[PDB]
Structure formats: structure tokens, C-alpha cells
Amino acid sequence: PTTVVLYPSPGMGHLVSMFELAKLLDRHGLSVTVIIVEPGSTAAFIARSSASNPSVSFRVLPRPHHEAHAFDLLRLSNPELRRFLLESPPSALVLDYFCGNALDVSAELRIPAYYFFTSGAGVLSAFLHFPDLHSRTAASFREMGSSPLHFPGIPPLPADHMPVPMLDRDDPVYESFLYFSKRLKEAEGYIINTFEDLEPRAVAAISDAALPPNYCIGPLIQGSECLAWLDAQPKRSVVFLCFGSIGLFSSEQLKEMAVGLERSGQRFLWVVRSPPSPDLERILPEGFLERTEGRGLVVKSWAPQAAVLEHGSVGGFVTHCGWNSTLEAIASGVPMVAWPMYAEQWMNKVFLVEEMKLAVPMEGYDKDMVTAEEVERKVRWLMESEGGVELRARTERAKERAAASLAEGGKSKVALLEVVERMKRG
Template sequence: MAGSRDASSPASSSPSLHVVVFPWLAFGHMIPFLELSKRLARRGHAVTFVSTPRNTARLSAVPPELSARVRVATLELPAVEGLPAGAESTADVPPEKVGLLKAAFDGLAAPFASLVAAGRRGGAGEAADGFERKPDWIILDFAQSWVFPIAEEHKIACAMFLILPAALLAYLGTKQANEACPRRTTEDYMAPPPWVPFPSTLTYRRHEAEAIAAGFRPNASGVSDMDRLWQLHRPSCRLVIHRSSPEAEPRLFPLLTDLFAKPVVPAGLLLPGDAAPPGGGGGHHQPLEAVARWLDEQPRRSVVYVALGSEAPVTAGDIRELAAGLELSGARFLWALCAPGGEPAAALLPGGFERRVAGRGVVAAGWVPQVRVLAHAAVGAFLTHCGWGSTVESLFGFGHPLVMLPFVADQGLIARAMAARGVGVEVPRDDDGSFRRDDVAAAVRRVVAGEEGEEMARRARELREVVGDRVRQERYVDELLELLHRYK
């Protein structure tokens, strides 16, 4: 294992690299890619961060001390019939339009090729800032399989950076493993994969399995998500990188390295500072002073923070049932409510809800500074959709036990893994994915009250001490850089 050095120091015995970083058009992807970019830049490397104009305007600004090493390059997203005007991220479209966003994303192949070709104008080392020379690496997301031919033409190494947990890649497996053991029925997708040789929590509920199966079929872009992901089998993809660590996901990195026959390595958790809201915090966001004052008045570790992310497919019925469950639980809560379809949040809540929970419950519509809320002394638990970013921030960052209400993709796998580690309780669901208010209330009570709740809180704090160790997490970035030098 490599020794750690000061993450803020650019000093290194190895020459600096020029790395092109190119995430998929979702803020849950762009933010970790930007966090990785900052860490590479702090270690003295030049980073070209690529996205579209509206997305780069909505992301947090690059810190001034890194502005000389992080260059932001924008590519205009082409229009696609059926895609709303101005839509440049998954936050701008309903779930059924994401396939069209991928079709538009595929239209960036030619401008991205031009961007890469422009980087060949200078020879290696000709420019002091590193940007005028050929890139040493392209770090890309799962979605842009068309990057690999471009990289191969210019003889540039690629690494696929997956912001999802290693558990999902282990569940999905290689193309060859899926061909050898095809999954044809919903029940097949509910079972642990046969290529995982040890007992695991890699299972899906029926409604989750049906959604996962859809990822193996072509969407509106004409390409399936799995066919995009499986491009990592190409020789030009020399590394697969996860926003994770062996402490967070034991046993999976050696398994994946053997399964995919190339290094599958952690970048660490890339724990962020407090992110700015999309759009830079303009006046359309609810003032948060009242929320902060309310939290200040609550007893230590007494509040359940409730947030289901901005992109989970939450229905109006889900919101009503969740509200009723929070009311029945009797717990103190702060709910960051993102209403589906841009509807007013108050219109979706049961009649008189806010009046009945006044004093012990607050509903904040719109953006809430999640990291800042999770850090508040009054917060003691998190009711979450189990997105990996939210799990990293809440459990590994602050040691909060979880009330888990997963919806799609990796979220069910994360919920099962965290339940097995005794740091959370999953809300039961029916086969169709529906859930009941009584089950929400019972799960909340189990996490926040009594000896069971105290034990979960203790385990969560212990897990945070191990997984969230900042020095160890930065060491993973150092080790990743050693691999980038070795494999370029």
C-alpha cells in the first residue's frame, strides 16, 4: 500500500498528468467526478473537466487555488426530438425521458473528438499548465461507450469511473458471465449472481428486479445501459475505478479484479464539502434560516432527516404515505421534500399535515444543504432512498443510522448491505413496490427509540470511524495516482 501524503500538496516524485474527466449528465455523477478532479489537481495534475454549459454553470465553482489546474470545457448538447428544450441533465427530465437524454449525449461524440484532438497541438511538457499537451488519461462514465474509439485513435488510456457501489458491478457481472448464465425471468434477477462465490446480500426485491432487467434492454437511445457499461471490457479501458473502499464493501474489489481481468480499484469515498444548490443558490430556493433555527432548538440526536434525493421516481402516493408514516411515528423530523413533476409540495401532503406535526416536524420544499444538515448535532438518523452518495454522506461521513426506502438501481443492494451490517432498517414493500404508512412508522421507531435504536446508532458510529477515516480515504487517491502512472 502506498504511503499517504498531504492531499493539499502538489509535490510528487512522478511527472504531472493531464487527465480528461467526463461524467454522465446527472448531478449524482458530476459532483463525485468534480470531487475526484479537485483531488487530482491538489496533487499537482492538470484536469480538463468536460460537461455541457448549463451543467457546468450549476455545479459548485472550482476553488480559486485550483483554478490553474482544473479547466472546465463545455460541449453543446444537440437537440433531440422529444427532449425538452434546455434539458441537459437527468434533473431536467422525467425518468421516461432519460433515454432521450442519452441519445443527445451520444451526439457529443464528434465535438468530444475535436476537443481531444486539440489537446495534441503541443508536445508533452510544452505547456506549463499541462493543458496544451495530449491527455494522458480519459476518465469517463458508464454511458459514453463512443469515447473508447476516440481514445484508441489518439492512443490515450481510459479508465471507467463508476460512482455507484462495487456491489452493483458485482451483481451485473461481465458480458461473458451473463452469456454463460443468462437471466431470463424476474426470479433470475432476484437471486444472487452465480459468479459471486461467497454468501452475499446481492439480491433484489421483485419490483427492483423488474427495473434492473430493463437496463439489459435497449432504451430510447437505441442502446441498453448494459451494452454501454460492458464497453469496459475493451483493452483501452485499463482501470475500473469505484467511488468506494474495501472497508465500505469488503471482499468485492479482489473479486471484481479477477472477474473483469483488469484492476478494479477504489478512489475512496470522495467525501464532499457542502455543495451549492443547482443554479448557484438563487432566489428560487426556500430560505433556510428558519430550518437552521428550528434544528438549533431540538435536542441532540433527536431529529430524523428525511430526503429521497432529487431523481428517485417518487409518486404523489408515495409522498402521502410517507407523510402519514412520519406522523404516526411520533418522531421529530426535517423533510427535504422534492415534489414530483414540479408540483407544489403542500398540495401533495395530507390535509392539515403540517399543522398536526407543528413543533416536531418541518417540511422544507426545494433544495436543502444536505451535508450541513447531516452535520448538525440535532440530527440522529436519516430516512433515505439509499442512493450511494447519500449513504456515503450520512452513514460513512457522520455515522447516522438509516431508515431505508430504496427505489431503483443500486439502492436495494445498498439497503440490504446496510441492514446486514446492523446500521439501518428497511421499510417493507409489496411486490409492486408500494409501501404502507404503518411500516414507515414502525421502521422509524425501531431506528430512533429503545435499545435497538441505540445499538444501531452505536454500530453506525463505529462504522463511520473505520470507513470515514479521512487520512485513509485520501490514501486511496494516492494509490489511484500510482496506477494512473503505471498503466498510462
């Protein structure tokens, strides 16, 4: 039996993503171990995973910016990783973008090392060519502001739309990102949670045979109260608003969205978290819950978004453009309004709006605050306008081209099968 070791970077988000890949490789006959470096209870995750997928093993390495402590942990983890790999060398190693230091270990032991890139191919291209651009300027991306950055196969990118940890060149975390992007070029191959029919130009631009190959296997996709509420509403009539894992708005900004949602007159399901420093009556405009009881439902902190997006009553998604939320909207054919917030979401927004044309922006996301007028305008536009009809049509195409890529013979199933064979023969 051929054995694969998958190495996510610390963080429940990275672990959940990498586990989805572990279940696939296992499905197709590989013997999978996931390496854990600890920074929402890893222990509970390992217990549930072992009960549901016993063939996937876990190995927890002993302990030696918000990404900055992760980067230190990973570096000081190379000795423990080395030893576990010396015990039983595997046929192949699968790394996270943040796990570049492990390429030291994988080269010494002559182990084929693949990256699992959990964002799209457009982002990979930007991340591939960032060190090049770094040598060609002295300015910070923050100093450059709206000056466009030109990377292969993707729209121009305003330099302040680069990821927040990369905005100030005079910081150690900037240097680590430069470091991880360079080491991208030492890979055997790139496994990407995208499908080729979604980002053709991007997939072409990186398949230049002066770079490792790449395999497009996605979309890889990962309570009772609001699902009930949705049942009681007509088909395609609800606007779903949900802003990722940590997303946070100020009470002032929450008041603008409330006013805009109310004046749009549309039905809504809105996930609200505590502002950065949830008490809905203290935070929301007075009488807003009373007045909209009936048309809208506000849920605190967390919603079952995968189910919500699959529900037939949902007609639209105001999203922070995280890549898991974007793939889940596409697979269910839900048209989007793009309101990016942190990590690489601003970049994702550009690709979504101008390359894929699957969303329209929420103007003001780059300003101090999105206005009530704008929230109302785009909510109306999404659920009523002929432009909204045109957009659903492109989202409908995307749903079918995604579902097709995953069915037998489709382009994702064949890309999966192709890399499995290549690890078996490693």
C-alpha cells in the same frame, strides 16, 4: 506537468461527481480538464467552479428512456472528442460508466483510459458480470421477479431489484447497458467512490487478477431555516427524511408517512416534493401541520442535506439509498432506514441491509405503498429500540473506519496517491 482529461456523461449529477475527482487530481499536482456534453445550468456550474478552483479547466464540446437521449449525445460526440484529444493528447483519460463509446477514441490514440465508478464496489461487480448472465437466460429481469441473481462477492439479488432501465430486455436502452458493461473490461483501472473497509468482500471479488485493478478513494462527498430549527432540538432526537434529487411520492403515500410520523411521536425533519402529475396544505392530511408544528418541520423540495446530516441534533435518516446520500450518512454516523426508489437504489438497499448491515428496510418499498403502520414502526425502532442502539454502534464503527481511510496513511489516501503516481508514469 501531467494532464488528465475527465469525461462525465451528460447530466448535472454526473458533472458534479466528476468535478470532485478533478479537484483531487489537481490537488495532487495533475493538470485537469473536464469535458462537457450538455443535455441545472451547466454555465452557472462552470462559472462557480472556475471562481473556486481556477486550475481545473473545462472544454465544452459542440452539440452534434431518460438515459436514452444521453446515450445518443455521447455517441454522436466521439468526433468532437477525437479532435480535442488530437490537439493535446493527455497522460490519461477518465470515463463515466455511460461513456463507453469514447473507448473507441482512446484506443486509436493509445491513451490510458480509467473508469470513475460513482457507485460502490458491490454495484460494479453486478455490472461487470451482467453480460455473462444475459447470455445464460432468455427471461427478462422483470419476468424473473424474485428469482435471485448470483454475482461475485455480493448477496443474492432479486432480479426485479436490478435497475429499472435494465428490467425489460426488449428495449434499446437494455442493449446500451449490455454494451457499456462489456466495455468495462477494456479499462486500465477502476476508480471507485467507495472505501475498502466498507465493502471488503466486493473489493476482493473484483480484484481477481483477470480484471483491471481498482482504487478505493472514497468517501468523495460534495437552508438557513431548517438548520436554525435543528439547533432548537436536543441531541440525536430528529429523524431526517429525504429522498434524493427527483424522488416523488403520491399524495396518498404522503398521507401514510404523515400519519406514521405523527403516531411515532418522534421529532422529524421531512423534505417533501410535488407528487408526480409543493402545496403542503392540499397534499398533507388536514390539520397535520398545525398538530405537528413544534415536533416536526416539513421543508419544500430541497434541504441542505450535507449540513443536515452533520448536525448534532439528527438521530436518524430515512433515505432512498442513493449512493451520495449513503456515503454522507456514514461519514457522519447517522443510522439509516432504507426506502429505495429509482436508478440503482433497490440494489444498494440489498447491499446496505444484508452485506454492510447499516440499514433496516422500510417494508413495502416493493409494493404499491408503504403503510402508516410501517412508517411508525421503523421510526420508533430507529430512535428507541435496542436494535436501534445496536445499529448506531455499527454506524459508529463505519464513521471511524471512513474517517480513518481518509486521514494520512489511511486506505483511501493511499489508494488515491497510488493512482496519481500511476498516471504520472503513464
